[PDB]
Amino acid sequence: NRDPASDQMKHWKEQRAAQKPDVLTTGGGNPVGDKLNSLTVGPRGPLLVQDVVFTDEMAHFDRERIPERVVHAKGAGAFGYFEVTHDITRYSKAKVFEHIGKRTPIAVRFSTVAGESGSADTVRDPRGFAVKFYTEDGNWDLVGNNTPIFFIRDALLFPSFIHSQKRNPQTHLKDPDMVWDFWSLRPESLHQVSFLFSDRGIPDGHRHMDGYGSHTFKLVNADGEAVYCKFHYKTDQGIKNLSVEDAARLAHEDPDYGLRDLFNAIATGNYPSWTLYIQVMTFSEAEIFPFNPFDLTKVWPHGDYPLIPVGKLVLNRNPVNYFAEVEQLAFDPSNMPPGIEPSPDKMLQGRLFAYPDTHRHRLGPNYLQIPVNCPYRARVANYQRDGPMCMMDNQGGAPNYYPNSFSAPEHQPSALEHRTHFSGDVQRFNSANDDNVTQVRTFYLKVLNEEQRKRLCENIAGHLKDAQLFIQKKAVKNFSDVHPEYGSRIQALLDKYNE
Amino acid sequence: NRDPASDQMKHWKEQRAAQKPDVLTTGGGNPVGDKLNSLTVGPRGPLLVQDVVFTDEMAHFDRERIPERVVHAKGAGAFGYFEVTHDITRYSKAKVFEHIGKRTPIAVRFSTVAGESGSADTVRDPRGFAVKFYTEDGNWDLVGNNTPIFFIRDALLFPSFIHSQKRNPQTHLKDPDMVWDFWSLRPESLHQVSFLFSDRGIPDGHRHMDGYGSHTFKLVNADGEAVYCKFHYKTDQGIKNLSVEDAARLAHEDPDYGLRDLFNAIATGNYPSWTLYIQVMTFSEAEIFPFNPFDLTKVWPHGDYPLIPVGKLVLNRNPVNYFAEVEQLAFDPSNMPPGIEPSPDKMLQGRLFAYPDTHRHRLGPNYLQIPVNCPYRARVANYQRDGPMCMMDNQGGAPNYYPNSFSAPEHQPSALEHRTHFSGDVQRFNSANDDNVTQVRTFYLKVLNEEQRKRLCENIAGHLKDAQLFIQKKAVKNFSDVHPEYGSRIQALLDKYNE
Amino acid sequence: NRDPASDQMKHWKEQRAAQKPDVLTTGGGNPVGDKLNSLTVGPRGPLLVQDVVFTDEMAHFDRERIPERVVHAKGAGAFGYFEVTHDITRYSKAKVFEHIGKRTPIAVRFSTVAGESGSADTVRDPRGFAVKFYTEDGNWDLVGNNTPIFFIRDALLFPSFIHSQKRNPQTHLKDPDMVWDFWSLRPESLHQVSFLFSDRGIPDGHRHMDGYGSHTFKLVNADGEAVYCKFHYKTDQGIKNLSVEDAARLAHEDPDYGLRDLFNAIATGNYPSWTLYIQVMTFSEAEIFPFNPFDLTKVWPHGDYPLIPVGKLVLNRNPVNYFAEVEQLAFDPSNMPPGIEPSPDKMLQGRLFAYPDTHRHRLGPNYLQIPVNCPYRARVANYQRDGPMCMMDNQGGAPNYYPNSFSAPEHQPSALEHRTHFSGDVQRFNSANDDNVTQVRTFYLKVLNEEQRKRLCENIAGHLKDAQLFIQKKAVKNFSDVHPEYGSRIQALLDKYNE
Amino acid sequence: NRDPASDQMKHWKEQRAAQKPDVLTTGGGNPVGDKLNSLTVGPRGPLLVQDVVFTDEMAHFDRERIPERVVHAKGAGAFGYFEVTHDITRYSKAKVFEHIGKRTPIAVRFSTVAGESGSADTVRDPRGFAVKFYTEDGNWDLVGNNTPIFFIRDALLFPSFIHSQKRNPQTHLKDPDMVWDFWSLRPESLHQVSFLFSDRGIPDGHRHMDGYGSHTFKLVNADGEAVYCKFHYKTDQGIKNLSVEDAARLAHEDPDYGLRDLFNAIATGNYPSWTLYIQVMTFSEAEIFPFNPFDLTKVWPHGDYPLIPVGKLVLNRNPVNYFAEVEQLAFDPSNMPPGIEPSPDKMLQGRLFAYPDTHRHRLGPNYLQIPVNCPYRARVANYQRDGPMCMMDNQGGAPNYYPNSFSAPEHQPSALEHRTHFSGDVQRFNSANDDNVTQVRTFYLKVLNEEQRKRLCENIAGHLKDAQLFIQKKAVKNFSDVHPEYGSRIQALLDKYNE
């Protein structure tokens, strides 16, 4: 007949067949007698407050919407599991990696970045790749993207960055004067602004892009020896991007392209999968290493720090109810079980607060209690109580202060975080100059092929062409600071567009 | 050992005797290494945002508080059950009356009216007595008080009334001028005021007071035949109240005297109970009734409208977590299942709206999903979706539109509300002068004895003495209207009080 | 040089003369010495909670988003004024229609319906034309669409309907089966459906479309005489639609097409305007009307009820800050001053409640306190106090109960609602069969020309084609009932579309 | 007549003068023609949804309450000023000390700690003394108590501490077991516990107590030279405390005693006052100091650190509207203007985050926009936009990103954080046993005289006696450690108390 997604209701009925339908009730469970005609005095008379059937349904409809994610509003999500296939026990003591074959339930959400909830899937914009691992040591959230780097390296620049990528404060339209102005004055974005305008910019679905932990992290073993690393999970279905035009029509053809693709895939037994890897770098290595190992606009090279195989990510389940299971999904980079710890990454360090914070605003103080966010394969026992919309039993009559002498939750010395020594004055160290070009250049020439090199410049100019001339010059100046031909090639394009 | 309440943690410990303490975790389930020392750079250095354990717990502590009920803030509740003892099935077709011996789970919340959450229990004030029955046809909330009447008879004066009863908008102090200016200008209150300042104004705990539906309601039987009613549930523990003396002592020695008392009684198997009677007035009798039958400031004389036994209200279970099960608790008079409906009572009418409304705010849009509020004994099936803090499965992938041809929930025609006829101009009818003295006079002369009339005027005068002279004149005048003696007895006391 | 729109900031920097820039501060006002480099311990150390500059800005960032409109999420807004051209005081004594020359300021917002914040303008959907009149008797919100009718006439089906027009509960994709299964079971939509898929289905910007209050309202002169009316505000920029083609092209080429068209329109001093009329109808005629004068799915033929010009609607200022002034707007149908009242129109009745409701949730309980929403040309004084985010002086130390003896706000008996008589039973009367064709038929073969009659039948089949066959028939059936050649034309298309 | 606080309305009216009562309007500005009777079909019929005057009013009342402060919920406020009586400029460059004589508008809130909104003032509890300086460098919030020390030196224990001090999670009653089990397990609380159970545990009104900054702060002059300090604002009204009998009496006689005492003292022109001092200490002295100078549980001996007079603190204005100006007051310790900086005080460190974090939930994301909270003396100009309930213009269309090329809010090197240096293995350093006896010892024998010691112990023994024998044992032990007698005395009373 037609695709699985299209036949959503058709199947819901079929399976629910040979069953008397449920009795329509109110929020409180009172059976409604008639829900098609309001209660009025006389056929042409006014509506009566007496109609609580009405107010019940209407009041709830009046509140359906919650704020969309400040970033990554438009996204898709599914569920699967993570299977350890290799032993990195010597790096992490994290139960998630315990043994070979250790299955741990996961939840994933894919998303775009700037576009609101109604935007279209297939547009130039990075791709969010969130992974929630429901482990025995609580949940671990690997909040990644389909790229290993990022436009900036200091939290303070983030809000501002995002603004430029979004709408104008007054006209409310997308504004290139803000886009490029920000990028012009901020040349560190060069590495990412390239990757973005490259083929990878617009992936053909969520299944044909790679996952990247992006930031540098820390791994701890059962013997307290820590080491840094990067997370990588390559697509088993391979990298397949969309053409600028192909995606262009799809854009208005099917703005939910990603959604559709991901659904039917899993809906037909054709579950996608990713292979998780890790680059490991010692504290000595990070010591000698040659730009800041925590710079988010830089990447460790496979050459020196090679990719190690860790396990498999398999998505074999679709959300039953999208709002409840995907939209309400909350991923906190701060959720890191023992064996995994943050790293000095200024950027990351900031995310440590932003994410749980906004979640309390977007979803509510007790969000970790929403089914899909709850650490259910673990046991939440603590001294936190109440808060609005408190689910469960608020931990019943348990003593609510630590320490105590009434057998309340004890602590785990084992779970103590690895300690690192840090010297140096406490202040705001400038990081606007850490080489916003070396790595970039290598991508252009080394990583990029003559063919992509063309479309990149072309793609950039295609957009930059709408910005003030003075902004254009700045942008070209940085690209040429990456390599004469880069900017030169771009610049050439610019002049034509400028009629 | 002390009273059961005092030993709350002692028994908790004991409870899980040999059992080992759970692991202290973060909201995310991640186990904690050391919850007593914040992660700082150096033994005397600054704090690290990197300390997520702190931030996790702190941010939560920071949101523990929810708005306290706008009125009836300070309360104490419990759980138990309701058992049928008489066949009143000829009047109501409600399932909760389905058959002699039938038991239905219930939850009850007692309370004062004006005081905020910190306020004392043993103060002159009506007492809230709210019952929630988790019946097959959804939850039925009978939101009564300890008095069968009320100060006003039109919902538009409610906020006004409640305002006067609370603190001064500027000084934030209780304003006797406010209190009596209101009552002085709206004599409909006389009745309730007289009941209030009588011995019943300060019951001895919650176990020694009657519960009243107050408002008239409509009962509909299986034949669609309807009748009006009045709910009454008398204390089997006997009526008992506190003198203005002990009460003032208890107010500073034990502001939670009602809480503690109710907890202990239940804890020690001394289960309190109320007998539920009802009054029945036929539509024909409501026509020739000497007063407005839906006037909240009036009562149906036992003489012509005798009480009829229904069943018992038993409370044999304390809340395990007060917040989760008592604070979050929400009663909606609008929650009436098939066989039980509202009357035109102007006051009742305004309530059908306000309670659920204020719940969407105090607790949140999905407060009906909070455990204690969910009609777990019924199967909520409707076309309502999403909203913040959406739990359960959001009814999954079921067809979210009605009507539909996909087997989603269907309306039940046998739950259609009994239809009554009303004819008149749609306007703002004035009920201010609907006789605010008769019934009052009866209470003064017949229901009370001389010993009581004396305590009533003393009690009335006590507070009233503080209102401006002009406000006292007016108020005394209002009493003299009920009975010459009534006014002079108060005026005599005033004259005294005023040096 | 570019358009006024793209030069938004451009002009801002210019007009900002040469005066220095304000000092970047925190919410508290403390000046920032460095907001580009987070406070860290060492040039490669962790982040300090002590960076309240960071925390302060990130925190705010995490909360910029608020729930979008349940419906009509996507739209534009501009301000201007209204002015009387004709005298209709013999009809309504509204303080806005006073005398000719009366210039009441206004606020307006155009928008689609189903599409979310990210959605695009250029697509088939009715348009929202809501006008806010800041009068002397409070604000008057004429919440209207680009059509005099609507798909349904009972509030109880609005949510359901608004569901069918949005995303599947599971897939989160638009769903034809939903769209058409709903319309199919409810032929009352016929009328408004016909328009949607008609040329008018896609206006060329907001300026080239007509505004309608849709519903039937009530006017009352200073003499107490009432009369039913219908509002019609025709565009002075002339009507104009967009080919299915262009609409789609624009859709993706410039999703926010309508947004800027409007902006530049005003920027380039070419302010848009509409002419306000009204269809008057005595109660006499209403009692005789061939249909229900309050049926939202019906119109009043112009020949029997001609348009009376009343005034000019001019928009000449663009929002300075989109969020604050447009996204934050609140239009409350219930906001009608003395002289203008609602009709028993079952849909209007429901809107009386719902709109203010959602506002309390989307914006906050004190939203009327938001600058844009505040009725600044009226003296808002009453007995309402407090609430979250209580701005203003919360009315100082003014008496907070009515009635009072301290000169607090008194009521104006000269603004009482107009008295009407309603005799009849209080029930849920079925309006499902209130004729869903007649007026529709005359729209087909009469209002539309064969040329555009076909373009209509095409537009429909292109969508109805995606629904299950069992759905398609029931769909045609209804159309057929309006006129065989109608459903036949469509059916034809389907069969071919159906390979 | 009666007191000024009691004549609140009497005066408001006369001031209102022979003026005429404003017209009673809805929240929308529409005049109400009668806000005393509801719109009903017939004088004894149903209420109509159409009564938007009702719902407009009703709905506000239902949303009047916001979450009470999680701690220090019960309090009173007042505005006034701060005058520079001296030159401290040689230490701190805060413009609030610019020149002797310069005035700085201030706001102050006094409060208890444990008790909720409706509790009594005259109870044993530390006292809150928050001062909000409205300077031209933003707002400076000095959130201090009436004690210079506290029960704990690590934020991580604050939530737990406050929990033990409030109600039992299940019975909702005060729990001596939670109170003492905690304190007993944390001797570091011995200092403040001593101070708390002494004559200072209940000050007679707010005007008769001292204000302390508690935490060690930081002052930076013009040469970028810093200094640690302790703020002190001694009372000019003199130290006056209440006796257990009088405080316990005033508990019921007048639970708002402190609130009324202050309103009147200010209403009759008897303005309270406080001199401000600071204890300056070098980084070399702090190095030498025989204790952790940032340990919140200790004082800087006057001998070594004499107090220096800075300026004055006068409260000469009562809040017009208590809720809007007091209840909503929000003091964030992080609001320190250039010149004042925090200290490594582990405790203070946590406060930097907490207060503003909790304000986001109690008041709202945009709280700093509330009048009483707005830094009206400074000029808020930055790149933070939107957020729920956006007042003002939202910085209009000015650029929202930083940096930019359109002359938007610039930096301010002058206002940068003074840099300090720290070293050590970033970790969770155990502060549990940093000597919790020494300073208490002196307090006990030197600060207190025999009659006081006698009292201090009876005040303790009387409350401690209600905790289980084992806690008492543990508790006594901690007291003896400070001093053998401190232990035996309290112990002595207990045995008697245990009858």
Ligand code: HEM
């Ligand atoms: C380090 C532990 C502390 C934390 C985490 C903390 C947290 C809080 C919170 C969340 C509030 C309510 C804020 C609001 O809703 O406006 C508050 C209020 C208050 N705090 Fe504690 N506080 C701490 C220590 C103390 C100390 C030691 C003092 C005394 C110097 C103090 C003085 C105050 C005062 C005066 C108030 C009331 C503010 C007002 O009137 O608006 N706090 N605190």
